[PDB]
């Protein structure tokens, strides 16, 4: 190809936003398993829309710092005073979860597997983080990731928590306050996948835990990168034939 | 047929050495300009803000693979020149088959190893072959010159 | 077989593992309505409309997407963009002022 | 630069089906045709048919056209250059004379005049069409005897009777025994059996020291049964050494 | 078979020897490709030459070939021991169908030949309790494989129950033979003290065995 | 799951000792030696590899389930304890004394 | 070149809680991964478990799990390491370490300083 | 043995004219791709920071000079194309020796004076010179077309 497919550089904590789905089976993707410092890529072949809010009406508020330059604020709250958050069908997400599973075990042995809320960190991996209409989101995972699935209704509604000042990439003393954003926003995405990581310490209950990952940013780009790869064209090449530099005369 | 009709960039990557043979102006074109032509047709879209606010982050990325683009691709058409033939796709030398590159004989070469298989296998010796020729040049180029004294 | 001679060919179908700064491809739709700054999305070229791919027959190549420059060229062209991007952007630093909060109910 | 493995001897009646596999390793299993030749002893070794892997094309021969139908499974890569693959040739309506020992061949080049003509060659694996039942090779050992009283050695074997049908195989102390190996084929008696038996060489002065065992088996009956040589013995040649 | 190739051809060590393939116009010769192998009776084949004139790959410029309008032609030079095995060729086109020769017992001659070396086993105690007698006659180390069996029992001719082989190549290039007897217990036990005859070179080898012994 | 094997560990310094280590899956093999006062220093990363000033007598030499650390000429320095680390797990460990 | 040290002599009664420092150096802090191991004396050497310093991303080992908590702090390049709800069974003396490359974090080729510990 | 073998680049600078006709391929490569072959292969060094922080002090100085030695070199293959003979190295003409530019005979001018020395001696005339060429071309092209028409 000349160029790749629509790469969306969406930029999430756990779950894998708007990509591309598997085509076949959902699928699963580990340098090692064993390396239990590694990410485990999963991608989803059904897309699990996941809506989510900040209901609040806001109203915007110039206060001019100067001379040319002002730093925008919320003046105030048009209506009711509410929670961020985001819906998604939990039949939807457990069926899918149906879906990891079993391709888990195949990477696994058919030991039953059970999955948990993140260890630690900051907010951003710690919590589904991610732009919803100009504004950051924190979402609190611990109900997509608090199950077991062995062998032998309504819907989910994730808390929110909207940070201004940012700081992507966790830079050098260098953070982004993102203004507010006028009124209320609502979007939706689809999960596409996530960012799974292992517990290295092999229980006799146990039995396997995958808690979300998401401490790097590199696994973003290689979710959808996977698929290609860049080589360099090398058109002059050496070959013998019968066939002389036609000198037998001059 | 096979040889007169369409067949694509880089097509003949598993196709033995023989069968490539036909389809070098593919992959002898666009080595430059597969993509200055893309670039200046595309580039003139009714956008205006060709290099607004001067040069970019994407500035460099084009620019500094632009001027790669075309001296690695001079740097094939100097060998073509410093070999004494830049005919292309195909040219004898009078440099002979040292078999202590490959022991190995005509009809499987061509026939059933292919160009990336073929380079593959002779890769190490490319450098000495490549110095022959030039040695087979110049020796060719005072041989011409003696000539143009006496007549 | 006959008095062999080494014979040279410009064109063939060989390549090599490899790393270069490579270019965006921006789109048609996106370009022309303004949505006035977003990204380094503007400073792309616009994509091809004929997405064109060649198939390559009896070929086998590895990929490995761990050891993959691609990505390593993602964040680095990321990062640089926002940067950039938020370079001419209002500083809040005098903002550093004692905040006397009280909540809201 | 690789190596093929088929399918083993798969024992037949006459008016019945049998398949024979051929499977690849060290080289790519598309690149290349799969011929197919047996070795009737009446006819000679004749040539079956030939399949491209790659197209799908074929051309079989004219005597078993309608007989025949081959078939091939999907490639699996090892390397960027290597693979492993599948192919097939199943015959309905047997009779007695579609018999000998099977080959399956990987052609000689990609591209030219002898592009199918065959260069890599299977394992060869006997087939055998009768209605008559199957029989076990029931081991057993030999009373040693001496080869040669000059040199000093002390010979022993193990001793096979009554199988059916071919082939049957012996090894030494499960792969752990090298040289002085020694064996043989075996012949159809009136009544219509084979028997076949093995022998190997050590000297008479160190009997005790090291342990030998023939890993005898047989693939039709399911059996892998063991034997040792019993060393108590009075012979010729072999009592002047002790 | 279709095509004829000459079932017999000899030639002396250090020398070269021709084997020749003709058929009616549809199977040789002329617009036909022709090859040769090296097909060992008792294992996998081996090829030799095919273009008609190019050697195949890991073969030795001993082996020539030639091809006429109604006939091909074989040349092996400076010829070896381990060459003693059958050879037939082929006839096909690009498209297609290989069409195989008779074959040739190619016989190399010339070479130092050696006497045999017998290993007469009789049967043991738990296979007498069977119950069967079988005496195995073991052949080794000689060539060419030529040999003669001629069972006694009580000194008489010995006509029934004559188990024989034919000599198979060992795999040091040189021959090897066995052989066998169906018998009962009720003749085996009582009867005199057993033997086993074989030949080679016109010098005739033999083990004498007891039953109770 | 390491089976660091053998425990008694006590020779001359003119000798040689080969310390093996068992496995039920695969990885990444290595080895280490504790000190007085000091922590544990590596001293393969690989297997066959070896770590920074190791000279030539450190062998490394198995591929099967049984992997062993040989270090032939010994020595005063050589007195502490090894470990065979694979992943997150740990052997057993041997002490060697004066 | 990449120095580690940490903290020294201290003290405690079973049922408490503590912390320790782990400041390093020669390398950015934030792109390579450490870990911790509970070197007991006579026992085999138990991982505690690993830290990516980037994001803060964890992972730990059952038996101390709940009880451990890893930490850092990118503006000091200082790793700590809280462990609340002491025994005797954990006494022993802790090491802070980080692989030989980014690449691999399972091989250690760069370990921690000496810090007493009593209970 | 002398013409065959080693030499070095620029290495008859101070040779005859004569002998410096052997080694021209010396210094008729690496006019481009002298730096283009050894900048790809040193700078893939594991640095992994090529053109961090984007472009800098180095990074002008090199594509500023880059791009110089291309258009420079293109501009010496430009007079080859335009003088009707991109062979290289060696080229006759219909283009006669005006003595004006040099009175001096054969013998001396090939085995006495070097091209450094030769060069100084004609640089006034060669703008003269290289203009006859040009338009001993577009005779020779009109020539051409002229019979072009009439077949
Ligand atoms: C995974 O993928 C999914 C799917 O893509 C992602 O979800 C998407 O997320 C994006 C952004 O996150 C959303 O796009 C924004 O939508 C909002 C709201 O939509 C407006 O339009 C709706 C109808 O569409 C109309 O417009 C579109 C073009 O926008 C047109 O194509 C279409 O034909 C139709 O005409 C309305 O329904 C909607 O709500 C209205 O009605 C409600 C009641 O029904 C009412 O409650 C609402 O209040 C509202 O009245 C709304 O009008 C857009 O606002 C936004 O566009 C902003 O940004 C662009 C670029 O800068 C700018 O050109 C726009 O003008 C606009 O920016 C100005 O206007 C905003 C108000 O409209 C204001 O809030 C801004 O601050 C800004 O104001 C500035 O400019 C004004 C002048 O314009 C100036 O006066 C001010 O002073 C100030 O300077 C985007 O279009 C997608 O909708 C959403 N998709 C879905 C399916 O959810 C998901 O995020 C992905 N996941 C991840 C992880 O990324
Ligand atoms: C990430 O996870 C990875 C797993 O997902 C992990 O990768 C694997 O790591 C292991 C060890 O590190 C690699 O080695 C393997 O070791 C096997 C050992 O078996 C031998 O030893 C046994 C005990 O001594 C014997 O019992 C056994 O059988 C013999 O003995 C029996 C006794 O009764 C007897 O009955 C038997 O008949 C027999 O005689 C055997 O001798 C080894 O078996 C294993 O399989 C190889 O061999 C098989 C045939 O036996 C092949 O079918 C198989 O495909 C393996 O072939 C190797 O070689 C091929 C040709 O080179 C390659 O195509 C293969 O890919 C494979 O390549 C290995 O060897 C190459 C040699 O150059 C080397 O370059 C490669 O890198 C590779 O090491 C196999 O050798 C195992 O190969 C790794 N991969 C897999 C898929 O398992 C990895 O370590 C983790 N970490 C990282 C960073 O990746
Ligand atoms: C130029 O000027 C500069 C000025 O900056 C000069 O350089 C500085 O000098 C400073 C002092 O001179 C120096 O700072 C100090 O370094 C201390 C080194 O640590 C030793 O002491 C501690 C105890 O304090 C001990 O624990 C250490 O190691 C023990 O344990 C190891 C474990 O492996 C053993 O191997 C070792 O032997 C040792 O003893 C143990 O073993 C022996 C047997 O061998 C047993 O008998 C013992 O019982 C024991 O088990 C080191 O030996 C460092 O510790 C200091 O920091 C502590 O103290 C301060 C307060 O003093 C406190 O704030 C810190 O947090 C820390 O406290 C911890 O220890 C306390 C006990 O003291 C404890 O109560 C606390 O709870 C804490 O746990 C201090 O930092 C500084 O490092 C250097 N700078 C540099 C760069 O080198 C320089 O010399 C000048 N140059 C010239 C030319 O003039
Ligand atoms: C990827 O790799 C694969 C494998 O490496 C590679 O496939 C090889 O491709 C080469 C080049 O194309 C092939 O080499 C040629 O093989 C020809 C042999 O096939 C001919 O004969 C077939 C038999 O037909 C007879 O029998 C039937 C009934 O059995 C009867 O009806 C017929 O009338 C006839 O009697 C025939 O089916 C076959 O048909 C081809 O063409 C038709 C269209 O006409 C097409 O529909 C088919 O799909 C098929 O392609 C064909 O006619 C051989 O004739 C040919 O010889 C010519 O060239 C050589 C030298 O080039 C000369 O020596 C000779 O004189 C001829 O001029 C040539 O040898 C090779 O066989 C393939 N091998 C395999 C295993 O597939 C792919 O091409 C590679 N692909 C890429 C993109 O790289
Ligand atoms: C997911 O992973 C976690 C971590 O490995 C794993 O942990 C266990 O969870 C149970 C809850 O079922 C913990 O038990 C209690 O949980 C309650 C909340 O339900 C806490 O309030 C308790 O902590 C307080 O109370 C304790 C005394 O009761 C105090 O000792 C403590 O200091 C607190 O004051 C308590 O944690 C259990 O402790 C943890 N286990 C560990 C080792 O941390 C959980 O089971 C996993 N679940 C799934 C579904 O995978
Ligand atoms: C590359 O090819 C050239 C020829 O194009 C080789 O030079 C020639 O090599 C042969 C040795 O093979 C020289 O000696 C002659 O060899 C034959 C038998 O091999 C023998 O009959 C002769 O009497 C003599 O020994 C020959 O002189 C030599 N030619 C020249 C001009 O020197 C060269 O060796 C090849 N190099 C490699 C690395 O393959
Ligand atoms: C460059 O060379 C050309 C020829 O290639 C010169 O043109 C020719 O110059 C001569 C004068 O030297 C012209 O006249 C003839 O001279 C001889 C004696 O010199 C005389 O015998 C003749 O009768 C006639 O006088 C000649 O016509 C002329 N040719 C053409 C086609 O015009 C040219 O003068 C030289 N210029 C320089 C600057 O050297
Ligand atoms: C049903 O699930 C159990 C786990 O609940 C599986 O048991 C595992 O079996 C594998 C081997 O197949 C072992 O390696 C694990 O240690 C077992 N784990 C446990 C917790 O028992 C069982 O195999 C599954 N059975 C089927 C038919 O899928
Ligand atoms: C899994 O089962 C084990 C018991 O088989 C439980 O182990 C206990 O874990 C607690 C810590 O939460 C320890 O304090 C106990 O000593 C453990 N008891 C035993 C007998 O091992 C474990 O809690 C179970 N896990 C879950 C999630 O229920
Ligand atoms: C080339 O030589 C190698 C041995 O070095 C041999 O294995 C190979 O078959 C030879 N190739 C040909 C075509 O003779
Ligand atoms: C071509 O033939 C040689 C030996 O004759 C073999 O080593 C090589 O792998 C073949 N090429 C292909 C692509 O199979
Ligand atoms: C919540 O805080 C605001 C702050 O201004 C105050 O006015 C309001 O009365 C508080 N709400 C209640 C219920 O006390
Ligand atoms: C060329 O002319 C000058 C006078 O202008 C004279 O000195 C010189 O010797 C001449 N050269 C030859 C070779 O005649
Ligand atoms: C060549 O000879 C001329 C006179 O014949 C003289 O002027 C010139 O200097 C000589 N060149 C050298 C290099 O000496």
Same mark, same amino acid.
């Given at each position: 190809?000349?160029?790749? /497919?629509?790469?969306?550089?969406?930029?999430?904590?756990?779950?894998?936003?708007?990509?591309?789905?598997?085509?076949?089976?959902?699928?699963?993707?580990?340098?090692?398993?064993?390396?239990?410092?590694?990410?485990?890529?999963?991608?989803?072949?059904?897309?699990?829309?996941?809506?989510?809010?900040?209901?609040?009406?806001?109203?915007?508020?110039?206060?001019?710092?100067?001379?040319?330059?002002?730093?925008?604020?919320?003046?105030?709250?048009? %209506?009711?005073?509410?929670?961020?958050?985001?819906?998604?069908?939990?039949?939807?997400?457990?069926?899918?979860?149906?879906?990891?599973?079993?391709?888990?075990?195949?990477?696994?042995?058919?030991?039953?597997?059970?999955?948990?809320?993140?260890?630690?960190?900051?907010?951003?991996?710690?919590?589904?983080?991610?732009?919803?209409?100009?504004?950051?989101?924190?979402?609190?995972?611990?109900?997509?990731?608090?199950?077991?699935?062995?062998?032998?209704?309504?819907?989910?509604?994730?808390?929110?928590?909207?940070?201004?000042?940012?700081?992507?990439?966790?830079?050098?003393?260098?953070?982004?306050?993102?203004?507010?954003?006028?009124?209320?926003?609502?979007?939706?995405?689809?999960?596409?996948?996530?960012?799974?990581?292992?517990?290295?310490?092999?229980?006799?209950?146990?039995?396997?835990?995958?808690?979300?990952?998401?401490?790097?940013?590199?696994?973003?780009?290689?979710?959808?990168?996977?698929?290609?790869?860049?080589?360099?064209?090398?058109?002059?090449?050496?070959?013998?034939?019968?066939?002389?530099?036609?000198?037998?005369?001059? | 047929?096979?040889?007169?009709?369409?067949?694509?960039?880089?097509?003949?990557?598993?196709?033995?050495?023989?069968?490539?043979?036909?389809?070098?102006?593919?992959?002898?074109?666009?080595?430059?300009?597969?993509?200055?032509?893309?670039?200046?047709?595309?580039?003139?879209?009714?956008?205006?803000?060709?290099?607004?606010?001067?040069? !970019?982050?994407?500035?460099?990325?084009?620019?500094?693979?632009?001027?790669?683009?075309?001296?690695?691709?001079?740097?094939?058409?100097?060998?073509?020149?410093?070999?004494?033939?830049?005919? +292309?796709?195909?040219?004898?030398?009078?440099?002979?088959?040292?078999?202590?590159?490959?022991?190995?004989?005509?009809?499987?070469?061509?026939?059933?190893?292919?160009?990336?298989?073929?380079?593959?296998?002779?890769?190490?010796?490319?450098?000495?072959?490549?110095?022959?020729?030039?040695?087979?040049?110049?020796?060719?180029?005072?041989?011409?010159?003696?000539?143009? =004294?006496?007549? | 077989?006959?008095?062999?001679?080494?014979?040279?060919?410009?064109?063939?179908?060989?390549?090599?593992?490899?790393?270069?700064?490579?270019?965006?491809?921006?789109?048609?739709?996106?370009?022309?309505?303004?949505?006035?700054?977003?990204?380094?999305?503007?400073?792309?070229?616009?994509?091809?409309?004929?997405?064109?791919?060649?198939?390559?027959?009896?070929?086998?190549?590895?990929?490995?997407?761990?050891?993959?420059?691609?990505?390593?060229?993602?964040?680095?062209?990321?990062?640089?963009?926002?940067?950039?991007?938020?370079?001419?952007?209002?500083?809040?630093?005098?903002?550093?002022?004692?905040?006397?909060?009280?909540?809201?109910? | 630069?690789?190596?093929?493995?088929?399918?083993?001897?798969?024992?037949?009646?006459?008016?019945?089906?049998?398949?024979?596999?051929?499977?690849?390793?060290?080289?790519?299993?598309?690149?290349?045709?799969?011929?197919?030749?047996?070795?009737?002893?009446?006819?000679?070794?004749?040539?079956?048919?030939?399949?491209?892997?790659?197209?799908?094309?074929?051309?079989?021969?004219?005597?078993?056209?309608?007989?025949?139908?081959?078939?091939?499974?999907?490639?699996?890569?090892?390397?960027?250059?290597?693979?492993?693959?599948?192919?097939?040739?199943?015959?309905?309506?047997?009779?007695?004379?579609?018999?000998?020992?099977?080959?399956?061949?990987?052609?000689?080049?990609?591209?030219?005049?002898?592009?199918?003509?065959?260069?890599?060659?299977?394992?060869?694996?006997?087939?055998?069409?009768?209605?008559?039942?199957?029989?076990?090779?029931?081991?057993?050992?030999?009373?040693?005897?001496?080869?040669?009283?000059?040199?000093?050695?002390?010979?022993?074997?193990?001793?096979?009777?009554?199988?059916?049908? =071919?082939?049957?195989?012996? *090894?030494?102390?499960?792969?752990?025994?090298?040289?002085?190996? /020694?064996?043989?084929?075996?012949?159809?008696?009136?009544?219509?059996?084979?028997?076949?038996?093995?022998?190997?060489?050590?000297?008479?002065?160190?009997?005790?020291?090291?342990?030998?065992?023939?890993?005898?088996?047989?693939?039709?009956?399911?059996? +892998?049964?063991?034997?040792?040589?019993?060393?108590?013995?009075?012979?010729?040649?072999?009592?002047?050494?002790? | 078979?279709?095509?004829?190739?000459?079932?017999?051809?000899?030639?002396?060590?250090?020398?070269? #020897?021709?084997?020749?393939?003709? %058929?009616?116009?549809? #199977?040789?010769?002329?617009?036909?490709?022709?090859?040769?192998?090296?097909?060992?009776?008792?294992?996998?084949?081996?090829?030799?030459?095919?273009?008609?004139?190019?050697?195949?790959?890991?073969?030795?410029?001993?082996?020539? %070939?030639?091809?006429?309008?109604?006939?091909?032609?074989?040349?092996?030079?400076?010829?070896?021991?381990?060459?003693?095995?059958?050879?037939?060729?082929?006839?096909?086109?690009?498209?297609?169908?290989?069409?195989?020769?008779?074959?040739?017992?190619?016989?190399?001659?010339?070479?130092?030949?050696?006497?045999?070396?017998?290993?007469?086993?009789?049967? *043991?105690?738990?296979?007498?309790?069977?119950?069967?007698?079988?005496?195995?006659?073991?052949?080794?180390?000689?060539?060419?494989?030529?040999?003669?069996?001629?069972?006694?029992?009580?000194?008489?001719?010995?006509?029934?129950?004559? =188990?024989?082989?034919?000599?198979?190549?060992?795999?040091?290039?040189?021959?090897?033979?066995?052989?066998?007897?169906?018998?009962?217990?009720?003749?085996?036990?009582?009867?005199?003290?057993?033997?086993?005859?074989?030949?080679?070179?016109?010098?005739?080898?033999?083990?004498?065995?007891?039953?109770?012994? | 799951?390491?089976?660091?094997?053998?425990?008694?560990?006590?020779?001359?310094?003119?000798?040689?000792?080969?310390?093996?280590?068992?496995?039920?899956?695969?990885?990444?093999?290595?080895?280490?030696?504790?000190?007085?006062?000091?922590?544990?220093?590596?001293?393969?990363?690989?297997?066959? !590899?070896?770590?920074?000033?190791?000279?030539?007598?450190?062998?490394?030499?198995?591929?099967?389930?049984?992997?062993?650390?040989?270090?032939?000429?010994?020595?005063?320095?050589?007195?502490?304890?090894?470990?065979?680390?694979?992943?997150?797990?740990?052997?057993?460990?041997?002490?060697?004394?004066? | 070149?990449?120095?580690? #040290?940490?903290? %020294?002599?201290?003290?405690?009664?079973?049922?408490?809680?503590?912390?320790?420092?782990?400041?390093?150096?020669?390398?950015?802090?934030?792109?390579?991964?450490?870990?911790?191991?509970?070197?007991?004396?006579?026992?085999?050497?138990?991982?505690?478990?690993?830290?990516?310093?980037?994001?803060?991303?964890?992972?730990?080992?059952?038996?101390?799990?709940?009880?451990?908590?890893?930490?850092?702090?990118?503006?000091?390049?200082?790793?700590?390491?809280?462990?609340?709800?002491?025994?005797?069974?954990?006494?022993?003396?802790?090491?802070?370490?980080?692989?030989?490359?980014?690449?691999?974090?399972?091989?250690?080729?760069?370990?921690?300083?000496?810090?007493?510990?009593?209970?």
């Amino acid at each position: 190809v000349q160029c790749t /497919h629509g790469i969306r550089p969406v930029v999430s904590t756990q779950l894998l936003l708007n990509g591309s789905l598997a085509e076949e089976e959902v699928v699963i993707r580990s340098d090692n398993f064993t390396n239990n410092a590694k990410t485990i890529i999963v991608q989803l072949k059904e897309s699990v829309e996941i809506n989510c809010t900040r209901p609040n009406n806001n109203t915007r508020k110039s206060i001019h710092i100067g001379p040319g330059r002002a730093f925008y604020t919320t003046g105030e709250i048009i %209506g009711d005073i509410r929670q961020a958050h985001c819906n998604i069908s939990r039949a939807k997400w457990n069926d899918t979860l149906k879906q990891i599973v079993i391709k888990l075990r195949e990477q696994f042995e058919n030991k039953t597997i059970v999955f948990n809320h993140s260890s630690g960190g900051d907010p951003e991996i710690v919590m589904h983080s991610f732009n919803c209409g100009g504004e950051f989101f924190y979402c609190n995972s611990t109900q997509l990731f608090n199950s077991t699935w062995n062998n032998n209704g309504n819907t989910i509604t994730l808390p929110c928590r909207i940070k201004q000042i940012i700081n992507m990439w966790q830079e050098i003393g260098k953070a982004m306050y993102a203004p507010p954003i006028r009124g209320q926003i609502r979007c939706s995405s689809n999960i596409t996948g996530l960012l799974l990581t292992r517990d290295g310490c092999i229980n006799e209950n146990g039995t396997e835990i995958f808690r979300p990952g998401g401490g790097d940013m590199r696994d973003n780009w290689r979710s959808e990168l996977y698929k290609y790869k860049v080589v360099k064209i090398e058109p002059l090449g050496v070959a013998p034939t019968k066939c002389k530099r036609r000198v037998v005369g001059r | 047929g096979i040889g007169a009709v369409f067949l694509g960039f880089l097509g003949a990557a598993g196709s033995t050495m023989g069968a490539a043979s036909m389809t070098l102006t593919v992959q002898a074109r666009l080595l430059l300009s597969g993509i200055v032509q893309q670039q200046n047709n595309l580039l003139r879209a009714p956008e205006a803000q060709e290099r607004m606010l001067q040069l !970019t982050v994407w500035g460099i990325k084009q620019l500094q693979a632009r001027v790669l683009a075309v001296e690695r691709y001079l740097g094939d058409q100097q060998l073509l020149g410093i070999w004494g033939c830049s005919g +292309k796709l195909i040219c004898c030398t009078a440099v002979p088959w040292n078999a202590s590159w490959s022991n190995k004989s005509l009809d499987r070469i061509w026939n059933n190893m292919t160009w990336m298989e073929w380079e593959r296998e002779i890769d190490n010796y490319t450098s000495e072959i490549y110095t022959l020729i030039e040695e087979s040049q110049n020796q060719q180029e005072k041989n011409e010159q003696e000539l143009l =004294e006496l007549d | 077989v006959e008095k062999l001679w080494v014979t040279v060919y410009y064109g063939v179908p060989v390549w090599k593992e490899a790393t270069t700064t490579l270019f965006c491809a921006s789109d048609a739709k996106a370009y022309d309505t303004e949505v006035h700054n977003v990204w380094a999305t503007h400073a792309c070229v616009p994509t091809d409309p004929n997405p064109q791919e060649v198939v390559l027959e009896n070929v086998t190549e590895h990929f490995n997407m761990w050891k993959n420059n691609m990505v390593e060229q993602m964040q680095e062209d990321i990062i640089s963009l926002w940067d950039q991007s938020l370079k001419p952007c209002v500083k809040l630093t005098p903002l550093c002022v004692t905040l006397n909060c009280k909540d809201v109910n | 630069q690789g190596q093929l493995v088929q399918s083993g001897a798969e024992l037949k009646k006459p008016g019945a089906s049998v398949k024979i596999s051929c499977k690849t390793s060290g080289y790519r299993f598309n690149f290349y045709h799969i011929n197919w030749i047996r070795q009737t002893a009446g006819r000679g070794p004749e040539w079956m048919g030939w399949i491209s892997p790659y197209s799908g094309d074929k051309n079989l021969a004219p005597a078993f056209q309608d007989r025949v139908i081959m078939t091939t499974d999907t490639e699996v890569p090892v390397t960027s250059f290597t693979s492993t693959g599948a192919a097939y040739m199943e015959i309905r309506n047997l009779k007695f004379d579609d018999t000998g020992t099977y080959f399956c061949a990987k052609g000689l080049l990609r591209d030219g005049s002898s592009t199918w003509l065959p260069y890599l060659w299977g394992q060869g694996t006997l087939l055998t069409v009768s209605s008559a039942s199957t029989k076990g090779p029931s081991v057993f050992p030999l009373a040693p005897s001496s080869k040669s009283t000059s040199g000093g050695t002390a010979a022993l074997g193990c001793l096979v009777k009554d199988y059916f049908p =071919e082939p049957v195989t012996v *090894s030494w102390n499960s792969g752990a025994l090298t040289s002085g190996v /020694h064996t043989f084929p075996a012949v159809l008696q009136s009544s219509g059996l084979y028997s076949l038996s093995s022998v190997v060489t050590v000297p008479s002065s160190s009997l005790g020291t090291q342990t030998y065992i023939c890993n005898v088996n047989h693939k039709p009956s399911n059996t +892998k049964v063991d034997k040792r040589v019993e060393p108590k013995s009075c012979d010729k040649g072999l009592e002047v050494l002790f | 078979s279709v095509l004829t190739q000459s079932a017999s051809v000899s030639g002396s060590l250090g020398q070269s #020897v021709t084997i020749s393939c003709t %058929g009616p116009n549809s #199977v040789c010769c002329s617009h036909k490709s022709i090859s040769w192998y090296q097909w060992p009776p008792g294992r996998a084949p081996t090829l030799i030459i095919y273009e008609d004139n190019e050697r195949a790959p890991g073969i030795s410029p001993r082996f020539s %070939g030639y091809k006429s309008y109604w006939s091909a032609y074989l040349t092996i030079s400076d010829l070896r021991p381990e060459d003693e095995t059958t050879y037939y060729c082929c006839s096909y086109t690009h498209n297609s169908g290989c069409v195989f020769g008779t074959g040739t017992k190619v016989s190399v001659l010339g070479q130092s030949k050696a006497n045999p070396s017998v290993t007469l086993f009789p049967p *043991s105690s738990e296979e007498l309790q069977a119950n069967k007698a079988t005496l195995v006659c073991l052949i080794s180390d000689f060539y060419p494989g030529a040999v003669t069996v001629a069972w006694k029992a009580d000194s008489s001719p010995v006509k029934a129950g004559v =188990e024989t082989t034919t000599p198979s190549k060992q795999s040091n290039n040189k021959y090897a033979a066995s052989s066998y007897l169906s018998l009962t217990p009720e003749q085996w036990k009582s009867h005199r003290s057993y033997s086993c005859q074989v030949t080679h070179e016109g010098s005739t080898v033999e083990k004498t065995v007891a039953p109770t012994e | 799951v390491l089976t660091q094997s053998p425990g008694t560990l006590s020779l001359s310094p003119g000798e040689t000792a080969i310390i093996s280590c068992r496995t039920s899956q695969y990885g990444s093999l290595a080895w280490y030696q504790q000190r007085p006062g000091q922590a544990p220093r590596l001293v393969i990363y690989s297997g066959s !590899t070896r770590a920074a000033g190791i000279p030539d007598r450190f062998s490394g030499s198995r591929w099967g389930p049984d992997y062993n650390l040989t270090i032939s000429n010994l020595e005063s320095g050589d007195f502490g304890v090894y470990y065979c680390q694979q992943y997150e797990f740990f052997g057993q460990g041997t002490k060697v004394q004066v | 070149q990449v120095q580690l #040290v940490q903290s %020294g002599g201290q003290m405690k009664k079973p049922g408490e809680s503590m912390r320790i420092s782990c400041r390093a150096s020669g390398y950015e802090f934030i792109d390579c991964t450490l870990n911790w191991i509970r070197l007991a004396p006579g026992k085999r050497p138990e991982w505690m478990g690993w830290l990516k310093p980037r994001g803060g991303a964890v992972n730990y080992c059952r038996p101390l799990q709940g009880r451990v908590t890893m930490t850092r702090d990118v503006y000091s390049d200082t790793a700590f390491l809280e462990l609340r709800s002491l025994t005797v069974d954990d006494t022993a003396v802790y090491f802070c370490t980080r692989g030989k490359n980014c690449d691999y974090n399972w091989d250690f080729e760069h370990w921690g300083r000496g810090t007493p510990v009593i209970v």
